[PDB]
Amino acid sequence: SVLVFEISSKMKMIEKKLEANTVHVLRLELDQSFILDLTKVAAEIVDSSKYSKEDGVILEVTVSNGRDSFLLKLPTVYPNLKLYTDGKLLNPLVEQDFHFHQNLIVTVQSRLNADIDYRLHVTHLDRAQYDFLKFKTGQTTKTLSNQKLTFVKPIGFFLNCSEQNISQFHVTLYSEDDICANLITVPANESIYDRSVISDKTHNRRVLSFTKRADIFFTETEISMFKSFRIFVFIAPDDSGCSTNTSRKSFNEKKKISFEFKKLENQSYAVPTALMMIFLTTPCLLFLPIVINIIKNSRSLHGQMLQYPVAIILPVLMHTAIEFHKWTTSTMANRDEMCFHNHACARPLGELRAWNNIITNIGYTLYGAIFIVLSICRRGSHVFGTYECTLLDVTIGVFMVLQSIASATYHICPSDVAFQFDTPCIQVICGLLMVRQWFVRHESPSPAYTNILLVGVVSLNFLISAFSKTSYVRFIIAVIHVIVVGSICLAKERSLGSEKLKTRFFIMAFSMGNFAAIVMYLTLSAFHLNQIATYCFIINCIMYLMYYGCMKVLHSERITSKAKLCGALSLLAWAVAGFFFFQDDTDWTRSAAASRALNKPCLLLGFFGSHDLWHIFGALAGLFTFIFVSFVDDDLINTRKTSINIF
Amino acid sequence: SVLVFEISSKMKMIEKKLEANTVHVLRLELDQSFILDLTKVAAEIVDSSKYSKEDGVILEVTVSNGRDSFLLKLPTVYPNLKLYTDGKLLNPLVEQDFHFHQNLIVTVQSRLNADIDYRLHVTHLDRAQYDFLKFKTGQTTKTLSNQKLTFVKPIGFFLNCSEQNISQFHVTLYSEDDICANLITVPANESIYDRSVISDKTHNRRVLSFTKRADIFFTETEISMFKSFRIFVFIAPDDSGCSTNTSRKSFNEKKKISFEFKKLENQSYAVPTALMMIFLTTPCLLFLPIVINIIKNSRSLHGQMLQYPVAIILPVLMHTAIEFHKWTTSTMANRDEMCFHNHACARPLGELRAWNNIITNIGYTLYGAIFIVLSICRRGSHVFGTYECTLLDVTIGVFMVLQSIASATYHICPSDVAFQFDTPCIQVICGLLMVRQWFVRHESPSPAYTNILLVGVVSLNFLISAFSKTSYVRFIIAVIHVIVVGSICLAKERSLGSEKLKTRFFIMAFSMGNFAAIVMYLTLSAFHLNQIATYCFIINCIMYLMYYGCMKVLHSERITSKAKLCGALSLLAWAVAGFFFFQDDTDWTRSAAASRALNKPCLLLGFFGSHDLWHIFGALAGLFTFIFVSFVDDDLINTRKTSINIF
Ligand SMILES: *[C@@H]1O[C@H](CO)[C@@H](O[C@@H]2O[C@H](CO)[C@@H](O)[C@H](O)[C@H]2NC(C)=O)[C@H](O)[C@H]1NC(C)=O
Ligand SMILES: [Zn+2]
Ligand SMILES: [Zn+2]
Questions:
Q1: Where is the region Involved in dsRNA-binding (chains A, B)?
Q2: Partners of B120 in beta bridges
Q3: Does B283 sit behind a cis peptide bond, omega within 30 degrees of 0 on the bond before it?
Q4: Which of A621, B7, B382, B518 shows its CA 20 to 30 Å from the CA of A523?
Q5: Which of B307, B444, B446, B460 to mutate to test the interface with A (most CBs of A within 10 A)?
């Protein structure tokens, strides 16, 4: 039998008993006072312990106001807990709906043949913080501070971009509590709870789980698709999307959140970009006096061009093609749940959420293209000087350009992919500079050593991503670090005859230098896994170029004044770049909400942060290091290859 | 005001008028006759034309039986059409629910202030075809033939694997009509229409859109996760997921479907696998008399091993690492919507849906490992014979092994990825055999030519996938085909001096041979895009090895009887392999339902189809072709390199 109850507007908690096989229909008449009133109706099952063995849905509640509707099926079962009380939000009535009256209908049923007591909570949350995103003339930023969020009273906004003349929009949520919450956004026509065919395929709803920070970027193309959005903030009752351990799953914890809503206008960062190019083009004047003037004073390739390793480009270009496919097929809402930027220092350009991280890689392209051009132009000598490193200096400029393609692609969506490919091209540039100085006095160094160098770099960075969740990953690196460095110490003595002068102290310097690094990242959690292999290559590259320079003065060979300047600029730029690299703090083993909570502001001009200066000083470091090795043996330009000392 | 109506069980169509701001509550009392009765309640808006300008949801209908519930929000808007009549299925009551009576409650509302006429259709579809998947003792396959499917009466099954002792399960749907339909499957506890947090991330519902065939594989690990499933078949009212063109979006078309339910037991295919290994190990006896006996009769590497191109392995191993990540992160339900197998010839092993397509690539691994071992073992001569191709014959065996890794990885999930990587390693094996015969009389062929060969293969197959949707993609291939072949014809005359004897007819044979192929795939839609570049490499490889053999008799050099046998086995095996390759019929430009409709049965032993014999005869073809080039110049073993003719 069906029982109809008339419920007043004053009644906020409704306690009734659902007799066996009885249906309760509760009605609340709605008038103009309910326009833009976001209402939450929740149901409680009194004496939840009585229904422990009863499986399935014990109580069914359906709430409707004629415009929106939802279903409350209790218990609502989560992976960790079962809740015998839950509610949902009813999209408010609008002035179009309103003499004539709307009405709020709640229907309660149960398949159980026993009597069931329940409680209905009708919560209102409106009149502010809903209808807040209305921007007055000449205003671009609005702020809500310390808005309280409970499991009973969620937060919810409505954004009409057609009404507010909004082209791009940014939402930021600040919280100091580490309490799990959810940021749900959908188009106004869509429903949070209503599933659509091909859910994962066609999905316009974004659910960002956060603790201390969360960011929403409504791109200009997304605003035009829907023209209006609904933003909701809920407390996650299960902390799985934000924490790995199960801790006090059942709780009643309030959460204070601060909001910032930006009305973004498309802009060109002409001042930070021009000042970045002036800073990057200034050190290229070192090429002018020594390298370029020789090209002025002077005025089979197909055998070298078809045997040159061009499959070293494929690891980077096949990653770029896959990351662009994964980016253009993703929906506008999926790009916010998937890509993890540092939104305190993320400046957008179109759909790109961090343009500063993409354009700051232009020093690698600029310098890499100069390394290729100058090496090709300055190869015009067979009896005097050291052997010309023309094709290895072109390979260093290729990986300098590839590092700009690999990093600009990582910064489009920084998600936890199998092959990271932000740093790895730096590790090849550093190993190629050691291969150059290894053979420069023996022979003309071959770019064929890039294959074993790149395969070892690509295989090692995939081996760290695969075992990153494990506890012994830093030991897997250390045993490879010893095997790789113990092989180089054995390759040196076999080549140089194990002389006590040069070979005996090369081994101790590299054994103590690399063991001091292993003790730092193995016995101490000094660096992150993404930074461990990159710091080890830079230190070994610097240690070898310092050994090569220390051996040069020990053999009574003078280092030119220019090579000492470029050598000190190489040490200085690698230390400044390594200081900004040390501040990345990106671990893909932690939860998505902990990866979102990390926010470090911009250091310079509102555009450059610690990461963008690592891109800028990593290319300066690669520039000055390339200019040092190219100038260090200029005093030997008139010495016969037979007289030249070999180390 | 709320109006309560009592509706009898005889009333199948309910026509009422929803007055302005009135709520109708309709009740149907349910008794034991409704156990396992899957019911569909649909609502119609009479005079749909009256509500054309009214936006949003005009009518709201909520149906519940105490155990299940749903919401009908009319009009249900699809991308192409708006439907003013739709319904959903109510999960049936069970004997646990049943003196005591259940009841079916329908609630009707409208936000409109005008009167609205509606019709309620209560359709029953049960007592057979629901509770049909009960398997009697000793029965493993059940079949339903020509089950009629309409938009008003959908199909729906219930599978209890705990009750039926089912470990693995396969569902197949056969239809001869090209009418769009949907195959929806979910766990019994889950709901088709109830959305879950992180929908795309945590999704156990599979929606397969099909026209003529659809397949479901319940793996052993999925059966254990849920233990019971609900299978539904609906007619897609919008044909977007199955057709590209909008055609008669509104229709009332019946569809006849045939079902086949298999109770699969885990099995080892010992007979097809052993007979495949006997067939693959038999032709290895050609290595025994000539190659191996020399190794018996006879009884700097680090310079070649560190300069050997090992970055040619990275394109294939970095694709395998990405396809395994995309496979282990996918849910059990997503692997059926994403991977497109030929399920008429797909034999499963564990989670792998096509084990026959993975294990038939073992001839590439077997032969590739023999190519590596024999080449390394038979390099022990500098004045007699042709130049030893030791490191290029190892590179051919590396890409022979890589083709087994690249194809076994493609067959785990054949989805439309950016880089296909099923054939491309064959194109390098065919180009490496031309590089071998190009230089074998000039010098020792270098594996360094693999870089430009692999980069061109990888770049070309990505260029076809990128432009596959376009209409001019076969012209993009043809201009690259002419540029590549016109470069080889120019490289031949520059090397051989443009002699009328050998160079003048090499150009005409390769210009007419490659233009005859272009006319076939450009002016005719002969091959698929996946097969175009692979057929062009095989024909040029065969044309060159035939030119090399025709030049050999023109220079009065005898071809040994064994090399003529292996040469005829190379032509025969490339024609048999090319006959099974021609039958792939995989186009990623067509709809997913058209990619699912393709089903070609197994040819041999219930295990081998056209594709699996392409894997088997593609390795025989690569075996016999490798044995031909290794034996063709054995008559020159006692001829000085100065006397040896060069062509
Ligand atoms: C968001 O705001 C816009 C603009 O204020 C709304 O657009 C108007 O919609 C009414 C119907 O309700 C039309 O009669 C007007 O022509 C529209 N005005 C303009 C300037 O286009 C839009 O409907 C609103 N959408 C939501 C979800 O509230
Ligand atoms: Zn970076
Ligand atoms: Zn294949």
A1: 1-267
A2: B14, B43
A3: no
A4: A621
A5: B307
